[PDB]
Design a protein around this ligand. Structure first.
Ligand SMILES: CCCCCCCCCCCCCCCCCC(=O)OC[C@H](COP(=O)([O-])OCC[N+](C)(C)C)OC(=O)CCCCCCCCCCCCCCCCC
Ligand SMILES: CCCCCCCCCCCCCCCCCC(=O)OC[C@H](COP(=O)([O-])OCC[N+](C)(C)C)OC(=O)CCCCCCCCCCCCCCCCC
Ligand SMILES: CCCCCCCCCCCCCCCCCC(=O)OC[C@H](COP(=O)([O-])OCC[N+](C)(C)C)OC(=O)CCCCCCCCCCCCCCCCC
Ligand SMILES: CCCCCCCCCCCCCCCCCC(=O)OC[C@H](COP(=O)([O-])OCC[N+](C)(C)C)OC(=O)CCCCCCCCCCCCCCCCC
Ligand SMILES: CCCCCCCCCCCCCCCCCC(=O)OC[C@H](COP(=O)([O-])OCC[N+](C)(C)C)OC(=O)CCCCCCCCCCCCCCCCC
Ligand SMILES: CCCCCCCCCCCCCCCCCC(=O)OC[C@H](COP(=O)([O-])OCC[N+](C)(C)C)OC(=O)CCCCCCCCCCCCCCCCC
Ligand SMILES: CCCCCCCCCCCCCCCCCC(=O)OC[C@H](COP(=O)([O-])OCC[N+](C)(C)C)OC(=O)CCCCCCCCCCCCCCCCC
Ligand SMILES: CCCCCCCCCCCCCCCCCC(=O)OC[C@H](COP(=O)([O-])OCC[N+](C)(C)C)OC(=O)CCCCCCCCCCCCCCCCC
Ligand SMILES: C[C@@H]1CC[C@@]2(OC1)O[C@H]1C[C@H]3[C@@H]4CC=C5C[C@@H](OCCC(CO)CO)CC[C@]5(C)[C@H]4CC[C@]3(C)[C@H]1[C@@H]2C
Ligand SMILES: C[C@@H]1CC[C@@]2(OC1)O[C@H]1C[C@H]3[C@@H]4CC=C5C[C@@H](OCCC(CO)CO)CC[C@]5(C)[C@H]4CC[C@]3(C)[C@H]1[C@@H]2C
Ligand SMILES: C[C@@H]1CC[C@@]2(OC1)O[C@H]1C[C@H]3[C@@H]4CC=C5C[C@@H](OCCC(CO)CO)CC[C@]5(C)[C@H]4CC[C@]3(C)[C@H]1[C@@H]2C
Ligand SMILES: C[C@@H]1CC[C@@]2(OC1)O[C@H]1C[C@H]3[C@@H]4CC=C5C[C@@H](OCCC(CO)CO)CC[C@]5(C)[C@H]4CC[C@]3(C)[C@H]1[C@@H]2C
Ligand SMILES: C[C@@H]1CC[C@@]2(OC1)O[C@H]1C[C@H]3[C@@H]4CC=C5C[C@@H](OCCC(CO)CO)CC[C@]5(C)[C@H]4CC[C@]3(C)[C@H]1[C@@H]2C
Lengths: 41, 135, 318, 43, 51, 91, 318, 91, 51, 41, 135, 43
């Protein structure tokens, strides 16, 4: 499991692309789910 | 422990056979450690030899503008790698590739011998000796 | 014939569409209103602005600065009217940047820009821009350094189009044509854009034909807080960066902060330390190298407070 | 290296075709809202 | 296509126009404001930073 | 490794050994292969500990500086905003 | 014999002299209380200080910094008592600087300092200092890296003496002896100092045997303003610099500004933005190159406000 | 400088001269020594003017930045101090 | 003057003392404070930055 | 007059020494004469 | 003015003697301007020759460490002066002094020819040609 | 260059004499206030 995920997330030719895409997915969810409004406001 | 240590010391001092058994084991290990070092040195020597061989396959630029640009890139690549102690082999290869492209290798060697760190110079020095074609 | 044109136009108006605005603004709410990228600076800065009128608008500004790639001095003057806007600013080294916008029609605007540098011949440039703003779309064409002196069209040309598909969805297009020298073939690039806009949140995307993708999301977190996230992907090697940030609108100050996947952290605090004076503090921290750039600046607008009898001229074509 | 004259003519045609394909899309977008209206009215 | 003599003359117009814009653009803006502003400022105050 | 070579150390004595030699004999008790292999693991283990502490220290610094650089200006701006709200509310 | 010693001591006490203080402090009122030299910095800085007690004094401090020659992190701890003071601070790179001062007698103090750097063997050092404070004079002897391992005295030794001549005039002496290596001859340098002190103004001078002269003047300009001027001359080439500056003591802030003959301008503003929080802004402008260094920092002392029942221990030998 | 060499330009005509040549003749009226010496002074005078303006501009920048860097923090600090004095005086 | 063997031993004392001060000086100061402060702080609070 | 003063003040081996000494003389006079107290306070 | 200009133009066009008087004055001035340039060039040439002569009197270091230190100082001095257009003669002299101390002048010339600005190179090139002792 | 042994002895004597001259001044300063007192009492 971890071997198939860590390699594709930090030691691959597209590691920088995956990290940017995943971070965007989290950020949008954090905002859209209303948690951000409940924490930052 | 002290009773065993006293007996062990007493046996080693007064029993020659006990020393002989221990000495034989130590001497046997001494051979293995030296042999291991030689095997490690040969493998390192093989890596140096491999690195010089790899440079021949990629080839070198022929035009003066490409030679200068390639030389600067190899110097820049070697210097960039020279800061990392894990890239001393790769840094030396870039310096070796550049040295082979520079028109006056002897002058560049004096620059490397003073500007490049000794651990990289040691590998590069063997590269020069291995590549008998270097002028 | 007008018979079909009138019927077509009438059916169009009944759709309730609206002008989506310039293509370059589809990410404004994130990239300019929330992210610090456009406000970050380093060193010391001081802007002394004098307003002489509001209708027509006329103000003169002296900027003193001491920092990374900041010119020691910059004199700028601008004049505005509901039909035109002219601005020019010159550095201590004589680099002159200018703008001249004129409304030939309320729906058609011509924008002219120049950048004359004495030191460098390459720097000198001229940009002509034409904009049309229909009831539901915007079209634009630009000509940067257009020349036919060599007997063939040369320079850079850009065409932009953005169309409102529904009251919330906007789709657009951008096209570039280039020919740096008549001896070499023309290069063309196309970019597709789109946006979905609502009161609480806005989503935008910008796709280059080269493969690069820029996407952003903006959401309001109440009356005083709003935040957005911006993502950039490049496939020139594969590289990508995602920036998350938020903006707070207090009474006497606005605080912006953001962090991105490359480990950079930056914040900007603008504070009204006085009625005519506004302070700005900017700090950018690179966590991978542990280095920080500090910026402190000030803005002073003496003229505006002493002339309240005339209100700002409308629709100045900035 | 410098391009040959026939290759330049190939590039000039290619570039023109790309911009023509763009303007074809712009015309589609201008007509797109009426198409989207029909879909909401198909059901 | 284009005559060589014509290209020299056309290029000369750009050279002259470049210099004029370099020197004349900012004073032109200041002139437009000074004569059309409401009210009209003093010549000294016209470029005073904050007085 | 010859019986005649090892036989050269035919005689030994407890008193002849020097204090340094007697202390060195204590280290001789441990098999050289094990002690050499234990020392190797010790270096690898000690390096990992130093790497973990450097990473843990570097992470804590990042969080501390991030909270300060963002929390300090915000706390001042937010605090000052509350004062204006209080003074306006007192009217 | 005590007969003369008592009569001599009695005649001495009736002269009304007073202890002039350490030689290194004869210019404190200018070089530290008015000039910005000791407060200037660049980049971002944050000091988080926790006070655990006031008698005995004990506080722990974490400093975060990102700027020119500022270590990313520094942990410092100190303990103090009316008879002793111990402090140590360590950088992220392990450089440890320490101090240990002990009062063997109220008039005699021993100061020990160390500077241990793992990276550089040259950096490691040790400084032993002995001070005596008579009723009208102060004497001091220092030994930096004192060693006799080579069979001869080596290192750096310094002796300082300052004597009050009258209730206002103080005259002093300083002597240095050095021997970096037993193979080379010892080097000795002497410095003469003096000061005239009054309530409104203070004048000081420091003359090196090498020919360099450092002179300063300090004058109070009221209860909230004081200013001073400092001059330095060197004859190593002939070079000299004169610095003029003033300090303002407002209720919630202290503003310092200075300019010198080399065209540098600098100012420091320390402002109590909150009861436990103090801000610092520093800017240094070089008018000959038009470059500026901006420094922003903060200090937080959470512990002190919550323990008012014990007052600070007296005469801690800082 | 020989009468025979200068005599080669025996004949001339007003119509033969080209517009550029007729315009160039206007410059020929001024003695070359004077015009060459006037141009030299013009360069030296123009350089001095540019040096004076650069120095005057550089001095004004120094005074402007000095007054701002010192006057701005002081004016804010001094102003805030007066408020505390006013609020304390109102007690 | 000085015996060569003595110089080796004396130098060794500095080497050991240097290491001890490097590691032991700060914990010593923290120990003095923790046991002699009035009041005595919590072990967790002893190095908390502001809590 | 000026020739004998300007040379010794800006284009001499000790020009930097003279400028520092003169500036100090002015600064002290400005403070001691009471003008500084009347202007800066 | 126009009446005089018309008469002047009329006289120049129709009176050959008027042209001859003017042409003689112009030709006489043309000689002086060319002669002045040659005098200026010789004075500049003398300064270059003087600069090379001055370097011989100060002498050059003999030890390798002093030669390298002196070379670096001369390169640093030449580069520091090279930024000021008024020190091109002094900068070239430092580059000339360094070039005379460097062990492989030909390689250093290629560096200067590419890294040093042409106005300084022109003076330095004449210095090399004037100093026939340069290898 | 490295110094000769006789030059070192010359330097060692010189250095000692300098510090001895300093201590002689310190003794004068310690006695200086009584001297200054006499001057005010001479008139
Ligand atoms: C009315 C006064 C206020 C408005 C001033 C408008 C200035 C317009 C441009 C002036 C000329 C600039 C120029 O020639 O630059 C190239 C020159 C370059 O040097 P040059 O003049 O040797 O080269 C010229 C080269 N050609 C001919 C090809 C263009 O740069 C300068 O002269 C340096 C100064 C530029 C301007 C600095 C800021 C403006 C002056 C101060 C602010 C205004 C007064 C405030 C009180
Ligand atoms: C308004 C009048 C037209 C422009 C006047 C000259 C502006 C000059 C300038 O800023 O840049 C020169 C520019 C371009 O100058 P260019 O075509 O001579 O090219 C030199 C500049 N580079 C190398 C960067 C391309 O002006 C133009 O584009 C003039 C042609 C367009 C006229 C309509
Ligand atoms: C909590 C977990 C971490 C506690 C501190 C651990 C310190 C470990 C260490 O050596 O850190 C070095 C690191 C730096 O590591 P570095 O690798 O950048 O530098 C050290 C490099 N060598 C080892 C080669 C000398 O320390 C810091 O950056 C600061 C750590 C403390 C942060 C603040 C803690 C108190 C406030 C909360
Ligand atoms: C990580 C940031 C940590 C900041 C440090 C702690 C802040 C403590 C604030 C204390 C306070 O006064 O609370 C006020 C309030 C508490 O009170 P309140 O306003 O919620 O309710 C009470 C209101 N009255 C008093 C009127 C009745 O808390 C907040 O609103 C906190 C909101 C979060 C602010 C955090 C800083 C900005 C975050 C920006 C996020 C965007 C990306 C940033 C990237 C960098 C950071 C990862
Ligand atoms: C009790 C905990 C709080 C007090 C900590 C005191 C630390 C004293 C020194 C520790 C060792 C430093 C060292 O060996 O440095 C040389 C080493 C050099 O690497 P080395 O260990 O490979 O080399 C050692 C070399 N000899 C043996 C010659 C000395 O540096 C480090 O280990 C880097 C980190 C230094 C310390 C960083 C700051 C202190 C830790 C964080 C703050 C305290 C906790 C806050 C919560
Ligand atoms: C307290 C005990 C005495 C000092 C313990 C060691 C301190 C080591 C240190 O910080 O620097 C070494 C220093 C000097 O080390 P050193 O004499 O070995 O010289 C190495 C350092 N340089 C090259 C810079 C001179 O310690 C001493 O001075 C020890 C002798 C004085 C003892 C009394
Ligand atoms: C008042 C007297 C000065 C009025 C402005 C004169 C501007 C002259 C000039 O060219 O300045 C260049 C100087 C800079 O000179 P410089 O020499 O640093 O840069 C120009 C270099 N050349 C000529 C090669 C391109 O301008 C400034 O530094 C700003 C001048 C204006 C300062 C502020 C004025 C308004 C506020 C009071
Ligand atoms: C040059 C500096 C110019 C600064 C810019 C102008 C400041 C205007 C102040 C306006 C104001 O509010 O005045 C308050 C007051 C005016 O009011 P007042 O306090 O005098 O009297 C009224 C008092 N009440 C209101 C209570 C009745 O002016 C001052 O006190 C001015 C003192 C001078 C301050 C100048 C800045 C610091 C100077 C430091 C000098 C040391 C060397 C510095 C080197 C760098 C500078 C050369
Ligand atoms: C050129 C590229 C095309 C895609 C894009 O540009 C780039 O163009 C936009 C299209 C958008 C989606 C369209 C419609 C909806 C339905 C809506 O439903 C809410 C409820 C509502 C209707 O039922 C009633 O209240 C939720 C959001 C979603 C999925 C949009 C997400 C963002 C998207 C993907 C945007 C994206 C940036
Ligand atoms: C964990 C790491 C260490 C600790 C730390 O995070 C990182 O924890 C954060 C909490 C912040 C404080 C919260 C609230 C306030 C009140 C505000 O208002 C004063 C109004 C005035 C009216 O008279 C007095 O009440 C002043 C600032 C202050 C103290 C903040 C300072 C920064 C602090 C200490 C931050 C600090 C860097
Ligand atoms: C080692 C060097 C020796 C000089 C020095 O250290 C360096 O030592 C100090 C001696 C000082 C002077 C001594 C006495 C007076 C008389 C006094 O008279 C006021 C009125 C008063 C007495 O009549 C009654 O109120 C005015 C000032 C003046 C001239 C001093 C100036 C500063 C001087 C020069 C100081 C200088 C720094
Ligand atoms: C000549 C050059 C250009 C102009 C300039 O010198 C250089 O001239 C200086 C005068 C300064 C101002 C004097 C007084 C105040 C009031 C103070 O207090 C607000 C209290 C608040 C209470 O509600 C509102 O009243 C705020 C700051 C301000 C405006 C100064 C700003 C900096 C200024 C503009 C300086 C500026 C840089
Ligand atoms: C050696 C170098 C040469 C320059 C310099 O030292 C260095 O030489 C010093 C001479 C000093 C002045 C002497 C006397 C006065 C008169 C007094 O006025 C109140 C007198 C009172 C009597 O009742 C009422 O008249 C005010 C002070 C002033 C002007 C001194 C200023 C500082 C000066 C200029 C010093 C200056 C720095």
């Amino acid at each position: 499991p971890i071997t198939g995920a860590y390699n594709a997330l930090f030691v691959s030719e597209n590691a920088s692309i995956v990290r940017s895409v995943v971070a965007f997915g989290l950020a949008v969810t954090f905002l859209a789910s209303g948690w951000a409004e409940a924490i930052l406001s | 422990v002290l009773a065993y240590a006293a007996y062990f010391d007493y046996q080693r001092r007064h029993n020659a056979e006990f020393r002989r058994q221990l000495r034989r084991n130590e001497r046997r290990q001494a051979r293995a450690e030296k042999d291991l070092a030689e095997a490690s040195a040969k493998a390192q020597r093989q890596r140096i030899k491999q690195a010089v061989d790899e440079a021949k396959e990629e080839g070198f630029p022929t035009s003066a503008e490409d030679k200068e640009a390639f030389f600067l890139e190899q110097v820049q690549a070697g210097e960039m790698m020279s800061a990392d102690p894990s890239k001393h082999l790769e840094a030396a290869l870039c310096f070796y590739k550049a040295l082979k492209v520079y028109p006056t290798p002897g002058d560049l060697i004096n620059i490397y011998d003073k500007t490049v760190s000794k651990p990289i110079l040691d590998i590069l020095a063997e590269m020069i000796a291995y590549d008998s074609s270097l002028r | 014939l007008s018979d079909l044109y009138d019927a077509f136009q009438e059916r169009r108006q009944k759709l309730g569409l609206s002008n989506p605005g310039l293509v370059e603004n589809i990410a404004k709410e994130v990239q300019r209103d929330v992210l610090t990228t456009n406000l970050m600076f380093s060193g010391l800065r001081a802007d002394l602005t004098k307003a002489f009128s509001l209708n027509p608008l006329f103000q003169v500004s002296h900027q003193f600065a001491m920092g990374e790639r900041l010119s020691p001095y910059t004199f700028a003057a601008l004049y505005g009217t509901s039909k035109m806007f002219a601005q020019g600013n010159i550095d201590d080294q004589g680099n002159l940047s200018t703008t001249f916008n004129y409304r030939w029609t309320p729906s058609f605007t011509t924008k002219t820009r120049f950048q004359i540098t004495p030191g460098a011949t390459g720097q000198d440039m001229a940009q002509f821009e034409h904009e049309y703003s229909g009831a539901d779309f915007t079209a634009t064409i630009k000509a940067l350094n257009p020349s036919f002196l060599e007997g063939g069209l040369t320079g850079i040309f850009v065409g932009q189009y953005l169309q409102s598909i529904t009251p919330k969805l906007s789709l657009g297009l951008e096209a570039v044509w280039q020919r740096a020298g008549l001896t070499q073939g023309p290069d063309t690039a196309i970019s597709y854009v789109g946006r979905y806009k609502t009161e609480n949140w806005i989503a935008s995307a910008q796709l280059q034909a080269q493969g690069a993708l820029n996407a952003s999301y903006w959401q309001r977190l109440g009356e005083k807080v709003q935040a957005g996230v911006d993502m950039t992907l490049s496939v020139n090697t594969k590289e990508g960066i995602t920036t998350f940030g938020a903006k707070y609108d207090f009474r006497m100050s606005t605080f912006r902060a953001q962090i991105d996947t490359k480990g950079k952290l930056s914040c900007v605090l603008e504070k009204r330390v006085a009625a005519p004076v506004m302070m700005t503090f900017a700090a950018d921290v690179d966590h991978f190298t542990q280095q920080a750039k500090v910026g402190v600046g000030i803005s002073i607008e003496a003229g505006g407070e002493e002339l309240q009898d005339q209100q700002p001229a409308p629709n100045i074509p900035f | 290296p410098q391009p040959s004259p026939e290759e330049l003519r190939a590039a000039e045609a290619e570039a023109a075709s790309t911009i023509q394909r763009a303007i074809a899309t712009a015309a589609v977008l201008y007509l797109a809202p009426f198409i989207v209206d029909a879909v909401y009215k198909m059901f | 296509l284009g005559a060589d003599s014509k290209q020299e003359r056309i290029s000369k117009l750009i050279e002259i126009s470049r210099v004029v814009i370099h020197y004349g653009y900012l004073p032109m803006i200041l002139y437009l404001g000074y004569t059309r502003s409401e009210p009209k400022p003093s010549i000294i105050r016209l470029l005073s930073p904050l007085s | 490794d010859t019986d005649s070579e090892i036989s050269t150390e035919s005689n030994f004595d407890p008193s002849e050994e020097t204090l340094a030699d007697r202390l060195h004999a204590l280290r001789d008790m441990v098999p050289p292969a094990y002690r050499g292999w234990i020392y190797h693991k010790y270096e690898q283990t000690t390096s990992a500990v130093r790497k973990a502490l450097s990473f843990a220290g570097r992470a804590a610094w990042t969080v501390s500086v991030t909270a300060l650089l963002v929390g300090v200006p915000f706390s001042l701006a937010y605090g000052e905003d509350q004062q204006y709200a209080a003074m306006e509310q007192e009217q």
